[PDB]
Write a protein that binds this ligand. Structure first.
Ligand SMILES: OC[C@H]1O[C@H](O[C@H]2[C@H](O)[C@@H](O)[C@@H](O)O[C@@H]2CO)[C@H](O)[C@@H](O)[C@@H]1O
Ligand SMILES: [Ca+2]
Ligand SMILES: [Ca+2]
Length: 497
């Protein structure tokens, strides 16, 4: 059945902060895995997330996504690789209990309640295609069926329906990020989504505004592939929706290939490349709600990508301008967006940039986990420097701007310019029309823009600085610094646009 349309409006407003639990904040030094895949302290826990909720909210985020927190039970005599895998949460044993290296059921309850108190949605990480060999039966006596990886469908469906509704009914979480979602067939996703919607509509909590609300029931698939595969294995056909939201890996790659370079070194692209990527949204069915991230726990940090391509390093101003340009693109992107912890301060692993292959896992340096670095949370685990504070304040400005302007989060996109040096989108929702423009070049340039090309009948006003841009003979002349972004309100839109 259809993507439930109330969630659709809510989902376009999501600004999600992703935390990798084991590598985030060691809030209780008495517990923690103490080993894992990555260079972090490996003692991140639920208390550390609870300690970070004020920080996450002040960033302007309105939701948090935790990597799996369920109980990965060690088996006597298992090797250190298995010890490290237990720290990731992605090969779990008891889907219905909290891993004690992260915390207790009571602390997981406390976390969700306090997040809701502060106006944040909470999403958990559901791995419904695989698990550890010692999986334990559900409270209702169910087990997944088949191999440990991947499990068999539809034999395993009843079990994972029970998992997916349990955490909603017990903790009132607002939905699920779905790991490696193509391991679960589309018919199963339709039924799991029905279970999620039914469980969500069966409970309420009091949000920060004082209203009793159902948990969102949001579900976002991780399908690390191009649009044709995200459609085939995630969204389903037009008229027969499987899932309603999936991560926008294709545009993530276009963004890092424009403002940095990707892990394989493709980079130095321009606005034309970004536009071509956004245009491929036309391949998706009408119900698809792509979710743009710049990175995650499986991708190299943006700042390390900048160093890997010999593009920039934190000692150079351009390192920060490129972060701002990439984050500004996310802020202008309609639909849910996800920020990976540390991008807001330009994090990067000291001493690391080039790809490390031999012996990378025992070092914490493989591409697929090197971003799992100890979190730098201002006032909690770090005192930020001037450039770090400047980027974090910029991100707070973007998230605030996004919250106030429907054109950014749910506006219709019309590309105005997409060449090698600039990218200009017109965004409009109801009576909110603006221009998003971002430089894609290390050269200062002045952009000549016809008011008649953007349905502007008057001035343009910068929504962050308030600078007014007036037309002469119907044309604006806008100076763009290298990789500068501008959010320009169309103060008087034309009768027709
Ligand atoms: O030692 C093998 C392998 O383990 C890790 O890969 C994990 C990953 O960390 C988990 O998050 C999840 O995706 O499962 C993977 C195993 O299937 C290391 O990240 C990886 O480098 C290493 O080769
Ligand atoms: Ca700890
Ligand atoms: Ca580095």
């Amino acid at each position: 059945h259809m993507c439930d349309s109330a969630l659709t409006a809510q989902a376009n407003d999501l600004r999600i902060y992703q935390v990798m639990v084991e590598s985030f904040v060691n809030g209780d030094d008495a517990i923690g895995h103490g080993t894992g895949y990555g260079t972090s302290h490996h003692k991140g826990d639920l208390q550390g997330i609870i300690d970070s909720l004020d920080y996450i909210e002040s960033l302007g985020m309105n939701a948090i996504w935790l990597t799996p927190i369920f109980d990965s039970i060690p088996v006597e005599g298992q090797d250190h690789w298995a010890d490290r895998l237990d720290a990731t949460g992605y090969f779990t044993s008891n889907y219905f209990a909290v891993d004690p290296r992260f915390g207790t059921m009571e602390q997981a309850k406390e976390l969700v309640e306090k997040a809701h108190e502060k106006g944040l949605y909470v999403f958990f990480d559901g791995v419904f295609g695989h698990h550890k060999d010692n999986v334990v039966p559900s409270p209702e006596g169910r087990l997944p069926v088949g191999e440990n990886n991947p499990v068999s469908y539809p034999e395993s469906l009843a079990f994972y329906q029970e998992v997916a509704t349990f955490w909603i009914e017990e903790l009132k979480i607002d939905g699920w990020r779905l790991d490696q979602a193509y391991q679960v067939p589309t018919e199963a996703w339709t039924a799991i989504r029905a279970s999620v919607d039914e469980a969500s509509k069966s409970v309420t909590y009091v949000n920060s505004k004082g209203e009793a609300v159902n948990p969102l029931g949001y579900m976002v698939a991780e399908i690390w592939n191009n649009e044709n595969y995200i459609k085939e294995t995630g969204y389903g056909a037009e008229g027969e929706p499987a899932l309603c939201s999936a991560f926008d890996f294709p545009v993530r790659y276009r963004v890092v290939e424009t403002f940095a370079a990707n892990e394989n070194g493709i980079g130095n692209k321009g606005g034309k490349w970004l536009d071509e990527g956004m245009n491929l949204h036309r391949l998706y069915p009408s119900h698809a709600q792509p979710n743009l991230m710049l990175g995650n726990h499986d991708l190299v940090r943006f700042g390390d990508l900048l160093q890997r391509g010999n593009i920039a390093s934190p000692e150079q101003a351009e390192y920060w301008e490129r972060h701002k340009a990439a984050l500004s693109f996310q802020a202008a992107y309609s639909g849910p967006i996800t920020l990976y912890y540390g991008e807001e301060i330009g994090d990067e692993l000291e001493g690391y940039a080039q790809k490390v292959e031999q012996d990378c896992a025992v070092q914490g340096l493989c591409d697929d986990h090197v971003a799992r670095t100890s979190a730098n949370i201002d006032g909690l685990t770090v005192n930020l420097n001037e450039k770090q504070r400047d980027l974090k304040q910029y991100v707070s400005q973007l998230m605030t701007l996004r919250a106030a302007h429907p054109a950014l989060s749910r506006g219709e996109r019309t590309n105005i310019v997409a060449n090698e040096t600039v990218y200009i989108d017109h965004k409009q929702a109801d009576d909110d029309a603006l221009i998003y423009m971002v430089s894609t070049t290390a050269d200062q340039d002045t952009v000549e823009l016809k008011a008649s090309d953007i349905a502007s009948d008057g001035q343009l006003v910068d929504l962050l600085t308030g600078k007014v841009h007036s037309a002469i003979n119907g044309e604006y002349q806008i100076s763009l610094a290298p990789f500068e972004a501008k959010f320009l309100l169309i103060e008087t839109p034309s009768a027709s646009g």
